[PDB]
Each structure stands twice: as C-alpha cells, then as structure tokens.
C-alpha cells in the first residue's frame, strides 16, 4: 500500500487486557490487535499466552507496508510485558530499542480507596 520500512510498536499492558499497535515514526497508526479480540474472555484474557497471540496477529495485519525495523515502547504493569517482545522478535522483525514509558506522578491527584475484600 505504501512502503515505510520503519515502525514503532506500542504495548499497553494493564491488569485486565493488552493492546498492541504499530505506528509510523510520526505516530500514525497502521494496525492493531487486542487479547480480547483473539478469542479470550475473562480470566484467560489476562495471561501472557493471549498477549503473544495478539502480538502475532498484529504482525500479521501490518504486513502490507514492508516494515523491517522496530522499536518497542512498553507501558503498564500487566502480565504481558515481555512475551509480546519475544513474539515480535519471532515474527521476523529487527529490534532496535526498548523503552519504558509508564506514567508516574510527581507528588498529583488522589487515588481511589482500598477495596475491603
């Protein structure tokens, strides 16, 4: 469709799900996939296996651009932080950089209250 040869993989790994998106160097999205869309509901949705499946589907879907290199930016504390990178490497891409971009307040706002389970 339009050759790019460079991309950035954004990983959003929370405690309940994981979302991976591929963008150009300028932030323009090209494709995405989630663990919940791959056929995993509830508890199964929050396992590293679902994360790697979603990563490989995203690599499948973004093939029409001739992407050769990647840099990874991970945010979130979820289980699927590192299996996603392994799946991306096994998809054939070349990995250049890895960075953590998880937000931290420098005080900020007030969090919710403890759950009394």
């Amino acid at each position: 469709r339009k050759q790019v040869s460079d991309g950035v993989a954004h990983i959003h790994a929370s405690f309940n799900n994981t979302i991976v998106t591929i963008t150009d160097r300028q932030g323009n999205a090209l494709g995405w996939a989630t663990a919940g869309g791959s056929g995993f509901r509830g508890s199964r949705k929050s396992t590293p296996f679902a994360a790697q499946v979603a990563a490989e589907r995203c690599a499948d879907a973004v093939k029409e651009y001739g992407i050769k290199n990647l840099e990874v930016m991970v945010k979130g504390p979820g289980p699927g932080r590192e299996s996603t990178i392994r799946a991306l490497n096994a998809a054939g891409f070349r990995i250049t950089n890895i960075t953590d971009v998880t937000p931290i307040p420098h005080x900020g706002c007030r969090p919710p209250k403890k759950r009394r389970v």
Partner: protein
C-alpha cells in the same frame, strides 16, 4: 501414598506369541478371574483381524493401537486458591493403559452376536481412524487444547 515406597509387579508373557503386551490386554479384558475365557476371546478376535487385514496378528494390533494413544491430558492445579484445568504430558505406560481401556470399553458397548466379533470389528475400524475410541481421543485432545493458556 504419603511416603513414596511402592514397587512394581512383574507380568508373564502370553504362551502362543511371547509378548507381555497381549498379556496386559488379556488382563484388562478379564472378568471374575477367568483368564482362559479372556485368552480364548482375544486369540479368536486377533486371528480374525489378522486374516482380514492379511499381514499378521502382532503388527496389525500395534498399528491399531498407535491410532488411539493420547498425547496430552487435563489435570487440576492451584495458584492462588483457585483451581484451573491444565494440560499435562502423559507417559508411555499410561498411554498404553489408556488406549487398551478405551478399546475394550468401546468394544463392549456394541450390538454384534459375540464379544470376539465385537472386538475384531472395533480393532479393524480403529486401525483406520473410525471408531469411538478415536473420537474419545480427539475429544480429550481438543479439550486439552482449549485450556492452553493455563499451562506453565
């Protein structure tokens, strides 16, 4: 048990073929301690299968047995107080035992005129992926495949 002490009991091979595996098969087929009846049934059915397939008694039986042995199974494990179904890998002796039990139980629940004919038909149909034993193996395999996220 609690102490991990138990040993293993030896078995004696069948007279006319000299294979312990047919001995275990006869043992599983035996009811009420009557071994002679079980050996009669096994020999008749196995020779009928041999003359129908045309190769021999032993290798036809082994070929039929190869199409039923499972590879993965489901057990239950705990991680944080909750129990999950998890796939595990079966051992060869367990594979043979499961295959033999499935063949015998599938054969018993048929509608022919004799037990030997039932067993012969079941083995013949299993030697080409058709019997209910093959169906049960497929059911177990796909059930294990569904619960794959929980392994490791």
């Amino acid at each position: 048990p609690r102490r991990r002490v138990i040993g293993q009991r030896k078995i004696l091979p069948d007279p006319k073929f000299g294979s312990e595996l047919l001995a275990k098969f006869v043992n599983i087929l035996m009811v009420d301690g009557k071994k002679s009846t079980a050996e009669s049934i096994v020999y008749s059915a196995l020779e009928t299968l041999a003359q129908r397939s045309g190769k021999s008694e032993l290798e036809a039986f082994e070929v039929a047995l190869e199409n039923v042995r499972p590879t993965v199974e489901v057990k239950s494990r705990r991680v944080g107080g909750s129990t999950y179904q998890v796939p595990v890998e079966v051992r060869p002796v367990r594979r043979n035992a499961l295959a033999m039990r499935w063949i015998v139980e599938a054969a018993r629940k048929r509608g022919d005129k004799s037990m030997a004919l039932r067993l012969a038909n079941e083995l013949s149909d299993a030697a080409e992926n058709k019997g209910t034993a093959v169906k049960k193996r497929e059911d177990v395999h796909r059930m294990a495949e569904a619960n794959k996220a929980f392994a490791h």
